[PDB]
Amino acid sequence: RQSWLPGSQIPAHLDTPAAQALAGNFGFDPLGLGKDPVALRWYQQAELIHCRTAMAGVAGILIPGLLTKAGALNVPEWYDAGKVAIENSFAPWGSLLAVQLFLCGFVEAKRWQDIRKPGSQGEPGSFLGFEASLKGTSELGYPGGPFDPLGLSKEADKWADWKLKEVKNGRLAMLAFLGFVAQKYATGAGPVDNLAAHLKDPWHVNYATNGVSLPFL
Amino acid sequence: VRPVWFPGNPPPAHLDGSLAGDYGFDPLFLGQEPQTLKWYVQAELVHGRFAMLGAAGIILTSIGAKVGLGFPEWYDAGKVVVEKNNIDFPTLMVIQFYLMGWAETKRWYDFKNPGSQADGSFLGFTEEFKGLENGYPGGRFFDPMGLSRGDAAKYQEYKQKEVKNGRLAMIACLGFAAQYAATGKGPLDNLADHLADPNHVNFATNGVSNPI
Amino acid sequence: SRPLWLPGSTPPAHLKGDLPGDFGFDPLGLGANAESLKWFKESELVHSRWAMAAVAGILVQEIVRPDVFWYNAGKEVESPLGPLGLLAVEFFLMHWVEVRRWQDLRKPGSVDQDPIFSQYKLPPHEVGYPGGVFAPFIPGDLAELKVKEIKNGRLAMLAFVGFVMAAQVTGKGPIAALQEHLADPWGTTIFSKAAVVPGQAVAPPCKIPASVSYKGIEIPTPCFLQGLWP
Amino acid sequence: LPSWMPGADLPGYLNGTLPGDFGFDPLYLGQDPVKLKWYAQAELMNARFAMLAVAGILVPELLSNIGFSWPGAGVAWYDAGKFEYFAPASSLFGVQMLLFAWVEIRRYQDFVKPGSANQDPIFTNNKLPDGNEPGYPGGIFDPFGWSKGDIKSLKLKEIKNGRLAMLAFAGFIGQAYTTGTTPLKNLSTHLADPWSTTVWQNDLA
Ligand code: CLA
């Protein structure tokens, strides 16, 4: 098997049939958090949700960020998108935050009750009729039905590969967003401009020169 | 009997003579545990290799410096190489830590698990990162000419020569350091100065070595 | 055991007499591994052949067209061909040839067939000695001519390094240096130019200049191992 | 038995059934057979669009230097987006995506279930023959009576011209980004002076 550190002793809780059947297992647990299988279950759920929302957010940063260097899509910088949006908008930000709290709390409550009980949300008479297709698909965190419309999740031969691509791209996306934050506080411009200013002069413009990222040198 | 570092004293129990450069020199008994002695074997070899390479650098640069070529002396080369080309100091140091950390970490985790890096995790390489002994990582990359797998007794001779030259180089580099701290001049300049007047230019004349 | 270098001595245990022109010369033991020894065998053959062709080039180049300093010749012969174009042709062509030969080395008996014309096939051989169209005929016998080629090769390699230093100290060609030396044998040797004493050390001045301005972008020209001359 | 490197070991999963199987995969991209199928179909499609593209960049420019008078007088291949048509490019994009959605999803439905998209939905008499071969349709897509010969030769030829055309279109992108000119003019100034117009020559400016 692959390991993060070849030659390192892989911990015994990440070496089970239950833990090796997880997407993107690389035996990485230096701080031994996942000693409890229930806790490992919950943490896997946390990783999946963070992956999906991280991909969505970072794509939202990049793709308008890239395409604005072309002609179309005049988009302001991601750290200024809220202001301009709310000046474009019709309501104050408080009411928008309240509405999103409601509409997201409902859904997250659903998903949470499905985490505590696996076959929960599908029981007769609960919803007006989507109770038909709100069960799980035998692997928690990966529902079916109205999710996965295109039927890509039906074939069994591509299954682990779709999983593994998801988790790898997601981990990379989380790293990307943390990078967005740090580059915002460090240099003071958009990430696309950081990429351009680094490709323009690599040996002079990096975090060894920005004067904040390591002040002792 | 083996030649001992001190003719007459028997050698300690943990030192036998299977190693290279084994003269029974351990008054503080720092290597009594076998794992600790194994680790110190690797430490001595690594320090010796960097010392040999460094002293060769110092001597060759000073030879080029005394003859009128324009090389700086070794206490000035860092400043003039960083200053003169364009090079930013910290990015060079950081890349040093990148590469050295990668390779050195490979070495560390090959010590902990002795045959682990020969699995194929690195790009595609198998049995060219398997170690031969403790601190002798001979494969295709580290023994390209192929001296370790032929003429085994002559190879033991090479081990002996490596350790002896390494120790000599370590105390040589210490010599360069303290010599520059005392006289404030270049090392081969000191060699020519002592070679001009041996009876009157030595350490007993600087006034810094013996303050009596 | 035929003769050997430093006769009367004993050869190393790995050199026996299979190869042409082996005399037991390995004090460092650089041929203990057979898998090394094959690569080094090919290395010796190739270096010898390049050196022979280059030494004959230098001699005949001086003879036919004198007063063209071979050590400068690149700054010379420049033609309507661009140097970039020459570098390109050399790169691609030599890349092809060396790759084919090396493929024959690491995988024997594979590149014997002409790729374009599928009729011709190079016959079986011993590595490093292809034969076929590479040698139309043998004057004499094989096992002697192998010895002769290795001898002329080692002599030629020494001759070329002699040419390089003989240019970087004097500043003339080989035959011109020979004329200078026959003009005064006691006064023009390497011992007659430089010496080291515990008092002082003196070296010959380098005749060859600094960075050479070929086409604006200058080529830095150093002499080999400048600081350790006598 | 041909190779991309005569003597070197070929990967085991390639067996010549694919057109143009030369055993070239130094990155081992096609170990799984499913990925091999998808990659093969992708190669065919990329090849055909490359061949049509390179034809559509050579032929207008080749017929530009000869001097006809249709309003495509040699403007460019990359300046095809600043010309007055008889429709702005937006509706062009719309109709394009509708028609190609129809065609490409139909083709994908053939690929997932081979032998299922054969008959004409409207005029239900017209039907493709049962030589399905996902990626090689047949029937009216081979209207002029070919495929009579040993088609492995013609498949091999199609894939060779496709690979050459893909590299050619990569060439058009690279040359037009670097020199910023038309490609037959690049061949013109290269046939003018082959020794002082090279890549190494131009990249030193
Ligand atoms: C291109 C260089 C080269 C190479 C690779 C070889 C290779 C070989 N020679 Mg060889 N040889 C050469 C040049 C070379 N020769 C020259 C120039 C001479 C004349 C002096 C000889 C004379 C010679 C004899 C008399 C014999 C060999 C033998 C051998 C074989 C076994 C020895 C061995 O393992 O060495 C491997 C060689 C190397 C690893 C190359 C070492 C290069 C070092 C590291 C560079 C340092 C050299 C130093 C700068 C000194 C330079 C000289 C100076 C005057 C300029 C081997 C195939 C023996 C043989 O045939 O047995 C099979 C044998 O009997 N050679």
Ligand SMILES: CC1=C[C@H](O)CC(C)(C)[C@H]1/C=C/C(C)=C/C=C/C(C)=C/C=C/C=C(C)/C=C/C=C(C)/C=C/C1=C(C)C[C@H](O)CC1(C)C
């Ligand atoms: C593994 C482990 C294990 C062992 O045991 C221990 C240790 C080691 C400690 C650990 C580690 C950990 C880590 C590292 C983690 C990380 C994380 C992250 C980074 C996340 C993020 C994450 C991230 C995320 C989600 C993100 C998201 C984002 C978003 C939404 C965005 C949004 C937006 C947009 C669109 C645009 C607009 O205009 C604005 C805004 C609003 C801004």
